[PDB]
């Protein structure tokens, strides 16, 4: 079905379904369904548009979205990269930030093992 | 981090220096050795010089730099590539 921008799956229990939005994990999913009063052992196939409306209401009332989340990620990163912080310097260099290894590992942030 | 209940680490030396500066209501360059002090927005116009193991670096403070320690803005390691 359609929602805040994720073309939802079909054979996925709702706890699994909601998680395919950028702003949700299983914790928030279960919490939302508890607030909504609808079971989680259902299918998008047997889903109701009124229930979709309830879902939309709760999430847009008490949670942020794709755009807000990605904008805010950019906001923190542009903040700490323009104010001259150590974290921001590492973000510029494409390097780990939390005090990790640089000598050997950290190919997840350096890219694949291009040989030198 | 320095948890809420304890309150921040705003060390007494430069606390006293800034008390002097804001009681005179004029703001000047300051030299300090304390990376470990976190920030209040009282410092926004104040200017600090901070040590890199080697020398000092005068640096000006800003609104959004609060919640941080000054050593975040003092570069410790030079690296230039290969």
């Amino acid at each position: 079905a359609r929602l805040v921008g994720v073309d939802l799956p079909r054979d996925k229990r709702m706890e699994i379904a909601l998680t395919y939005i950028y702003g949700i994990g299983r914790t928030r999913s279960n919490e939302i369904l508890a607030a909504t009063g609808i079971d989680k052992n259902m299918r998008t196939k047997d889903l109701t548009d009124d229930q979709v409306t309830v879902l939309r209401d709760y999430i847009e009332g008490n949670l942020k979205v794709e755009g807000d989340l990605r904008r805010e990620v950019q906001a923190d990163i542009r903040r700490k990269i323009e104010i001259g912080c150590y974290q921001g310097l590492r973000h510029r260099r494409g390097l780990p930030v939390r005090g990790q290894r640089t000598k050997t590992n950290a190919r997840t942030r350096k890219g694949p093992k291009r040989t030198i | 981090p320095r948890s809420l209940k304890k309150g921040p680490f705003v060390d007494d030396h430069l606390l006293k220096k800034v008390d002097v500066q804001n009681e005179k209501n004029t703001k000047q360059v300051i030299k300090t050795w304390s990376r470990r002090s976190t920030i209040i927005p009282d410092f926004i116009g104040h200017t600090f010089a901070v040590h890199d193991g080697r020398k000092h670096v005068p640096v000006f403070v800003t609104e959004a730099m609060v919640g941080h320690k000054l050593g975040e803005f003092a570069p410790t390691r030079t690296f230039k590539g290969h």
Binding site: - | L4, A64, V66
Partner: peptide
């Protein structure tokens, strides 16, 4: 940015 509220949470 919301530092006035940061140092209401921090006191």
């Amino acid at each position: 940015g919301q530092v006035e509220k940061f140092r209401r949470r921090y006191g």
